[PDB]
Structure formats: structure tokens, C-alpha cells
Design a protein around this ligand. Structure first.
Ligand SMILES: *[C@H]1C[C@](C)(N)C(O)(O)[C@H](C)O1
Ligand SMILES: *[C@H]1C[C@](C)(N)C(O)(O)[C@H](C)O1
Ligand code: NA
Lengths: 7, 7
């Protein structure tokens, strides 16, 4: 990944 | 805020 969130 | 990211 490498992105974040939170979903 | 409250959500995340990262942009
Ligand atoms: C990350 C933060 C959030 C968007 N507030 C959440 O709690 O709904 C999610 C489950 O985790
Ligand atoms: C959060 C993580 C990321 C999406 N990889 C980024 O480094 O581009 C952003 C600036 O911070
Ligand atoms: Na904030």
C-alpha cells in the first residue's frame, strides 16, 4: 500500500 | 479532523 485511509 | 489521509 502506502496511502492511508481509514475506510 | 477524524478521517486520515494522506493527501
Ligand atoms: C479511521 C477513522 C474513521 C474514518 N473515523 C473511522 O473510525 O470510521 C474508520 C473505521 O477508521
Ligand atoms: C501520506 C502517504 C503518501 C500518500 N504516500 C504521501 O507520502 O504521498 C502523502 C504526502 O503522505
Ligand atoms: Na484537523
Amino acid at each position: 500500500x502506502x496511502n492511508x485511509x481509514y475506510x
